Amino acid sequence: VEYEVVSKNLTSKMSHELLFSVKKRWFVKPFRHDRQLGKLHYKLLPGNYIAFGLYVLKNQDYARFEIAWVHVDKDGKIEERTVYSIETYWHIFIDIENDLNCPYVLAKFIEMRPEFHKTAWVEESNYSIAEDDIQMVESIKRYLERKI
Numbered sequence: 001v002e003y004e005v006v007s008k009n010l011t012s013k014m015s016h017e018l019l020f021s022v023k024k025r026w027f028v029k030p031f032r033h034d035r036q037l038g039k040l041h042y043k044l045l046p047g048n049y050i051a052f053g054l055y056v057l058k059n060q061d062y063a064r065f066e067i068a069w070v071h072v073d074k075d076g077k078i079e080e081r082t083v084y085s086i087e088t089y090w091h092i093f094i095d096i097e098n099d100l101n102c103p104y105v106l107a108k109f110i111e112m113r114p115e116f117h118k119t120a121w122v123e124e125s126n127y128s129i130a131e132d133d134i135q136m137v138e139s140i141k142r143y144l145e146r147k148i
């Protein structure tokens with residue numbers, strides 16, 4: 001199964017979506033990264049993945065952050081759900097990058113946001129976090145709650 005997520009930076013707004021490998025425990029290698037529509041493409045062994053989404057209306061100093069759970073079965077059948085959604089000031093997410101005491105995956109995801117008018121690029125990372133998906137997703141929430 002190849003699944004589609006949006007990844008675009010426009011003068012008005014950005015929308016930064018990234019899948020995550022519960023299995024490899026670090027972001028998923030996209031084969032194609034379309035700059036022509038604002039899209040990423042994915043090759044993924046059927047199983048469990050976390051969609052990290054970041055939407056930002058800059059003229060509103062606005063940013064909505066969401067974590068969804070992507071469950072796709074051995075028949076290729078997709079089903080999603082959001083597990084988490086926070087809304088907040090965009091300027092706050094920027095500072096979270098520099099925040100040292102801030103969940104690495106979160107603090108790195110913010111870092112992978114797309115260059116102006118282009119598509120965020122997932123890198124070959126052979127580093128793996130300590131926590132399993134649940135512990136992680138939690139501390140990513142534990143933090144944001146406090147950081148707002």
Ligand SMILES: [Mg+2]
Binds near residue numbers: 071072073
């Ligand atoms: Mg299942």
